[PDB]
Amino acid sequence: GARAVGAGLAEVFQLVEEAWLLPAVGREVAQGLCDAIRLDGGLDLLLRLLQAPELETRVQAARLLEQILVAENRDRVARIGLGVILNLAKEREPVELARSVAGILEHMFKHSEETCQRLVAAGGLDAVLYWCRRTDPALLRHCALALGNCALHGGQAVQRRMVEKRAAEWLFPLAFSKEDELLRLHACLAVAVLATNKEVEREVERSGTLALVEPLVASLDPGRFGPDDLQRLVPLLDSNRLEAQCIGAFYLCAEAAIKSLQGKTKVFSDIGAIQSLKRLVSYSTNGTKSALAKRALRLLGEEVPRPILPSVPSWKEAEVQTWLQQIGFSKYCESFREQQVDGDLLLRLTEEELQTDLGMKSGITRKRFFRELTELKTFANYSTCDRSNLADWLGSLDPRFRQYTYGLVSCGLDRSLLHRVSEQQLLEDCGIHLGVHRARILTAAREMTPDVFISYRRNSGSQLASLLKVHLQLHGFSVFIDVEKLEAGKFEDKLIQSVMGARNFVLVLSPGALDKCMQDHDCKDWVHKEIVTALSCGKNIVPIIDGFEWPEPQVLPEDMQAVLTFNGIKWSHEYQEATIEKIIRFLQ
Amino acid sequence: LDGGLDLLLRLLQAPELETRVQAARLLEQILVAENRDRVARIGLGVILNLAKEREPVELARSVAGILEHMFKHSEETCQRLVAAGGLDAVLYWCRRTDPALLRHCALALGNCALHGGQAVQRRMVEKRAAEWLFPLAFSKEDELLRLHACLAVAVLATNKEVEREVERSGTLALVEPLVASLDPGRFGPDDLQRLVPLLDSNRLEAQCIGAFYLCAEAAIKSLQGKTKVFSDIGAIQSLKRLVSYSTNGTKSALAKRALRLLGEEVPRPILPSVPSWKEAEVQTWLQQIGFSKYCESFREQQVDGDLLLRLTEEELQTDLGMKSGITRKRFFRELTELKTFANYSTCDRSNLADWLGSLDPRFRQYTYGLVSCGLDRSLLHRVSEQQLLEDCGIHLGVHRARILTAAREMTPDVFISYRRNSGSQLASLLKVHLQLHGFSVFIDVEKLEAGKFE
């Protein structure tokens, strides 16, 4: 298309790129071209400049290198990308080119796995995790997507290492930051991805940054805004999770609402995200994800008829036909209607009936079918039949057991009369084909307040509260925070109980934090309520000041006058290792 | 539609309870799907209204109606309302006297039970929803309120995990002398797919409500019916079965007239004594259970009333034509629903049927099998699983095991007398309060309204 000049080259002082040597032409250009001159543009000299002394030229060349905007450039740096890591390690000083090197990493993980392993092993994660501690509206938006890449690109050998290094914890503050909603999206995507290898879901949930995804995507709008993210997002809305299915659906409605302004309706036909969206709508018990998926699927086409009724044991021919529509078996919708397949002739179905009558000759198709039948028998509402509530006794062994509930209650078996069943009876009658499930069912049938609380300004002190929470959680203290639940929790109860139950109370005093709380002599402001309840126990309240002038007691109402009597510990955005260890002795 | 906006939520959140009342009165008209969705997205001000507004200030008539209109949404709404003090308000305002507030609380509870799945029905009953729903059923005025309470109790008594507790309440049986009196001329989105499981139940107190509500919604269907919606929900076939094996008159009259409104009344409630049918009776039954197509074969093989209680899968597979094993799973569903209804008196000498139906009411179907082989109460402690499987035809191994096991081993605290037209309202509340306070209570109209005899 259009053409860019061959800019002159000096190699004299590197001052010639003080404006990056070509701003707003092929780089920082926003025209109808959209193509970077990065191909054949730039060479090895940048690596040398980063390797060089005189940190000013290091900063300039790193700023330039933040535009690894093509495949071959990433390959070529990966061939020699160790000067990057030396830049990381030696450059951890708060000198503010972290905005550049962290962005290099962000752009660099998206390469093959081996790059991610060598970076993570050789102090690569150390930099991004350490710079998720610094305050900047654009550096953090680099670290967040860096971690999201390292988790989404890299396989399990690096996800496990990330989580060992507490990636989810250090990724919490990025999610819980009032400003930069795109930063919250880029942090919650990373946590959702990390919570999709089952070996880690325990630790990610221990972190506390996972649930916060739900009251983040429930509010924002697909009008908000990684190569082939789609084949790497579909495993986010195939998960058995809510905090990850919501992100998968939101990102996919975003990347289907900005697909050439009009979609493409073929890329999703290859990745097969539309079918998984259909079964995300159908068996969905939620509104958030079932609305995001609904509008995304409408953007693509053919919204599913219903979120099908939860009570299978009492469907009829009609409901079953509608379900067969919803699960790709529309072709067989005739035979399941020529045989009057009721809602029991679909939960007491087996392979011989399918093999002969219904036409499903291909054993693969009856393996797919029973995959869907198991994803529906674990969703069903066995209330019209399950007298003794066997389903909860099954789904409490292995959530894949619940599918057998109907088998075990179409034969009278209940909680009482189950200690007298034997493997032959289970196999022939209850239809529990897998010998391992039979063995586990017989075995299980035969044998039969957080440490500290941070109350804070919900508009300015949130940023400091996030870091305090994650620092102290990595220091062995359990912490509760307000917005882990909601933002509208103005009502009195459901959180004060922990406030007196808290073993400590650290208050983030940001400047002007008392503007809304002042003149609220009614104590209507419910953080002013929290400040009032701070003095309830005298439970070692340790205020943390941040540039907030320490106000005089007389202007301050007596319900919170005595709070300032306790000393306020200075907080420095730098050297937080020292401040936290200063704070630990004030905790107990 | 596009009428009204978020400002109402702000007004509810506002002080000056008079404007709260006005805006809540307006918000009682969530009359479209999208409005329910949009409030459900932010419907917490409703719950704060519920909690802070528990004071008898008489806008409960408004907020309770909001809830009534609000449960009908998906399950998650019902769970979040019930958990966050939502049921607390409706159960608290089934304690206040008003001819229109109660007609809101009753239908609210009926929605919460009927819409919401088992996770919320169990919670409702844990909170004693059936007890607090008794007074609404037993209130002499507002017959529509009695209907809207008995529908809710009938729905709650259709998940077997709860039928015990609902029967413990005492508000269940009161449904029978409530629908036997009133008339389909008396008067929930797609209630029908959620009503059919009320007349598929193994209950009388719930089949009567299912049949009455369905004859109502078939007597006011566009002034003339539709005779296609019921053909898709499949309520007509279940109505035919409700008539046929019915032992009662109430439900078998409601179902009869509803089915007449729709079409093709059943030939009769078939004779209760199967062991002595002939070709003709069997053919009539095959008519009544959708097997009309196979009738010819059951008449080409002179299928008597033992050649229908001693039938098995090879005889059906070869002769009678039913090749499709699905259809012979349906057929044995119907054969079991008839062998549990039959009158084994001409054959069952030692009354084995009562010894079986006292283990699992699904056993009674085996009675004929066990008395076409001489087995009786005495000579049953000497039978063994091989004999049961081959001769008695007790296919399911679990049923064989249970039959062998069971064969080898072998005044209320307070009384309220009252005026039957003025003191009934107070008597209901006293009964439910004291039952929730650990006192058993008997009341008059739990039996009848004409019990003048001594």
UniProtKB/Swiss-Prot annotation, chain A:
Residues that bind NAD(+) 2: 457-458, 487
UniProt-reported outcome of changing residue 67 to A: In WQH to A mutant: Increased NAD(+)-binding to ARM repeats, leading to decreased NAD(+) hydrolase activity
SAM domain segment(s): 315-379, 389-448
Effect caused by changing residue 410 to A: Does not affect phosphorylation level
Keywords associated with the record: Cell projection, Cytoplasm, Differentiation, Hydrolase, Immunity, Innate immunity, Mitochondrion, NAD, Neurogenesis, Phosphoprotein, Repeat, Synapse, Transit peptide
Active site: 530
Subcellular location: Cytoplasm; Cell projection, Axon; Cell projection, Dendrite; Synapse
EC number, as in UniProt: 3.2.2.6, 3.2.2.-
Binding site for NAD(+) 1: 20, 27, 66-74, 107-110
Effect of residue 374 to A: Does not affect phosphorylation level
Stated regulation of activity: Autoinhibited: in the inactive state, the enzymatic TIR domain is held apart by the autoinhibiting ARM repeats. NAD(+)-binding to ARM repeats maintains an inactive state by promoting interaction between ARM repeats and the TIR domain, thereby facilitating inhibition of the enzymatic TIR domain. Following activation, possibly by nicotinamide mononucleotide (NMN), auto-inhibitory interactions are released, allowing self-association of the TIR domains and subsequent activation of the NAD(+) hydrolase (NADase) activity. Self-association of TIR domains is facilitated by the octamer of SAM domains.
One Pfam match: SAM_2
Subunit (UniProt): Homooctamer; forms an octameric ring via SAM domains. Interacts with TICAM1/TRIF and thereby interferes with TICAM1/TRIF function. Interacts with MAPK10/JNK3 and SDC2 (via cytoplasmic domain).
Comment field on protein domains: The TIR domain mediates NAD(+) hydrolase (NADase) activity. Self-association of TIR domains is required for NADase activity. The ARM repeats inhibit the NAD(+) hydrolase (NADase) activity by binding to NAD(+): NAD(+)-binding to ARM repeats facilitates inhibition of the TIR domain NADase through their domain interface. In contrast to classical ARM repeats, the last helix of ARM 6 does not fold back to interact with the first two helices, but instead turns towards the N-terminus of SARM1. As a result, the two following motifs ARM 7 and ARM 8 reverse their directions and lie perpendicularly. Moreover, ARM repeats interact with different domains not only within each protomer but also of the adjacent ones.
Family statement drawn from the similarity comment of this UniProt entry: Belongs to the SARM1 family.
Record-given protein name: NAD(+) hydrolase SARM1
Species for this entry: Homo sapiens
